[PDB]
Ligand SMILES: *[C@@H]1O[C@H](CO)[C@@H](O[C@@H]2O[C@H](CO)[C@@H](O)[C@H](O)[C@H]2NC(C)=O)[C@H](O[C@@H]2O[C@@H](C)[C@@H](O)[C@@H](O)[C@@H]2O)[C@H]1NC(C)=O
Ligand SMILES: *[C@@H]1O[C@H](CO)[C@@H](O[C@@H]2O[C@H](CO)[C@@H](O)[C@H](O)[C@H]2NC(C)=O)[C@H](O[C@@H]2O[C@@H](C)[C@@H](O)[C@@H](O)[C@@H]2O)[C@H]1NC(C)=O
Ligand SMILES: *[C@@H]1O[C@H](CO)[C@@H](O[C@@H]2O[C@H](CO)[C@@H](O)[C@H](O)[C@H]2NC(C)=O)[C@H](O[C@@H]2O[C@@H](C)[C@@H](O)[C@@H](O)[C@@H]2O)[C@H]1NC(C)=O
Ligand SMILES: *[C@@H]1O[C@H](CO)[C@@H](O[C@@H]2O[C@H](CO)[C@@H](O)[C@H](O)[C@H]2NC(C)=O)[C@H](O[C@@H]2O[C@@H](C)[C@@H](O)[C@@H](O)[C@@H]2O)[C@H]1NC(C)=O
Ligand SMILES: CC(=O)N[C@H]1[C@@H](O[C@H]2[C@@H](O)[C@@H](CO)O[C@@H](O[C@H]3[C@H](O)[C@@H](O)[C@@H](O)O[C@@H]3CO)[C@@H]2O)O[C@H](CO)[C@H](O)[C@@H]1O
Ligand SMILES: CC(=O)N[C@H]1[C@@H](O[C@H]2[C@@H](O)[C@@H](CO)O[C@@H](O[C@H]3[C@H](O)[C@@H](O)[C@@H](O)O[C@@H]3CO)[C@@H]2O)O[C@H](CO)[C@H](O)[C@@H]1O
Ligand SMILES: [Ca+2]
Ligand SMILES: [Ca+2]
């Protein structure tokens with residue numbers, strides 16, 4: 001059982017995507033997770049984008065878990081250096097039919113009033129009380145308090161290539177971050193048992209958020225654009 | 237305890253390096269693991285390069301294992317597409333004071349006569365009876381029959397950037413291969429317990445080999461050059 005999709009660019013009204021909150025597809029084909037007005041990113045923004053169809057990560061009959069690989073390119077432009085950009089974007093896996101969670105440092109995937117399980121890879125740009133120096137890549141399981149973290153230097157407004165790979169036989173989730181214009185490479189990996197934290201069917205996608213009003217800073221913002229995205233999963 | 241070294245280039249007669257067999261440092265400073273005469277790679281070649289000083293990967297007293305990260309760039313030029321280039325290069329970890337093993341598909345690290353333990357990451361270009369489609373990255377533990385492998389497409393004569401990282405806490409060995417001119421990225425990882433396969437002190441380095449004469453093909457060859465190399469390791473306590 002193999003499922004896969006590829007997006008070289010994005011089209012307005014793409015029927016295979018489910019856009020939520022502020023997420024929208026620009027005219028020149030980029031998926032803008034968070035709000036940008038007249039070329040300027042705004043604060044108090046949150047948006048998600050999910051693949052329209054659910055994917056099966058494991059089968060309770062056979063007990064088998066899927067292996068998958070997804071690659072995407074994103075760009076984060078931070079026009080206002082002072083006082084601090086926020087908040088970041090993530091790639092996540094969650095039960096189907098979920099609603100956008102809290103914004104800010106919760107990236108829009110965590111909902112305290114009614115938490116749902118999730119596995120996510122974050123590209124965190126704002127340092128909350130629970131965070132190590134930013135920016136950093138982090139692996140999150142049911143919480144934004146990462147199990148593993150690695151710092152990285154952002155290519156402001158540049159293109160970033162990401163590769164996320166999960167091997168069921170070893171339970172290893174490894175992600176690679178590359179900034180071609182700088183030639184830098186960042187790698188992080190950890191063990192995660194999907195069967196143990198997620199249901200048989202899930203949704204995959206992205207979620208991002210800009211500065212929360214509580215911070216009283218309109219400069220706490222940046223863009224969170226997704227340029228392309230391909231996904232592939234295999235359940236034996 | 238933290239050890240590390242960085243070679244942004246290679247000098248003739250590198251005091252910090254121990255060259256074996258065909259390995260040699262060119263005039264323009266690249267480390268040529270296998271023989272190349274007048275700009276042409278030859279068959280029947282094998283060479284290794286080890287960091288002169290041994291490194292401690294684990295301590296029997298504390299039971300602690302080290303974490304490490306190594307980055308290097310290499311280039312493999314395949315002048316003769318037919319009938320098949322060979323054999324590939326590897327980065328390996330082995331007990332100190334070992335001798336070059338068999339060439340060919342054994343890369344010069346495996347010795348059937350008297351086998352010694354080793355952990356290696358291979359960049360295999362010839363398909364032996366025990367191999368999947370080539371080229372591929374492979375993780376080898378005491379054998380060239382990889383535990384895990386992933387295929388990749390070579391940038392002939394181009395530059396390749398490699399990042400190998402080992403985290404003791406999870407026992408995860410993850411390697412990343414990138415070809416900047418093509419923008420391609422390959423990743424592979426697996427679990428390896430160093431403490432369980434290697435001695436407390438080891439040697440780290442590279443080894444490569446070209447077509448073995450038994451194949452009766454002088455075209456079974458290619459270059460195996462290392463452009464730069466940095467290593468780092470933290471053994472807490
Ligand atoms: C942050 O964004 C939210 C969503 O865009 C704002 O809430 C929505 O604001 C609309 C415009 O005023 C209003 O029609 C909607 O009812 C409201 N949604 C609800 C029910 O929460 C949120 O705050 C609102 O908008 C600002 C401009 C003020 O007018 C507030 O009084 C509203 O509640 C935004 N945060 C702020 C206060 O900037
Ligand atoms: C929010 O971003 C603004 C634009 O980046 C900051 O203003 C800019 O501050 C620069 C100083 O580093 C100055 O050269 C620019 O001309 C100015 N641009 C504009 C259009 O405002 C702003 O900084 C605050 O406001 C400015 C006017 C000064 O009073 C600064 O001392 C203030 O810090 C940023 N606000 C914050 C909270 O940092
Ligand atoms: C493959 O490379 C070998 C080097 O590791 C060659 O070994 C030969 O070893 C001899 C013993 O010391 C030495 O005199 C020779 O110079 C050297 N090769 C030559 C001729 O330069 C091996 O050469 C073949 O095998 C040896 C034992 C002799 O019979 C040579 O005449 C053969 O050419 C190389 N094999 C091939 C097929 O080229
Ligand atoms: C070993 O590599 C050689 C160089 O690529 C091959 O020879 C070259 O083959 C080309 C077409 O395949 C031909 O246009 C070139 O002129 C020729 N170059 C030379 C110097 O020979 C060689 O291919 C075969 O063997 C050679 C000797 C010729 O007879 C070719 O016509 C053959 O295809 C490669 N060896 C093999 C067996 O593939
Ligand atoms: C959880 C979350 O969404 N957090 C937001 C938030 O972050 C906090 C920080 O900005 C922090 C730094 O001073 O300030 C907090 O709020 C202030 C508050 O405004 C004051 O009245 C007083 O209570 O002090 C606290 C801090 O101690 C913010 O909640 O905002 C930033 C944007 O600037 C990010 O969006 C975080 O994700
Ligand atoms: C063991 C080793 O290092 N392998 C070399 C070797 O690989 C074999 C293949 O090239 C294979 C292709 O036909 O041929 C083998 O040898 C022949 C032998 O010469 C014949 O007489 C007959 O017995 O069949 C066998 C194989 O069936 C080679 O051992 O050579 C290649 C060079 O192209 C590589 O260097 C491998 O690493
Ligand atoms: Ca954060
Ligand atoms: Ca091989």
Ligand SMILES: [Mn+2]
Nearest residue numbers: 124131138146
């Ligand atoms: Mn974080």
Ligand SMILES: [Mn+2]
Nearest residue numbers: 360367374382
């Ligand atoms: Mn192999």
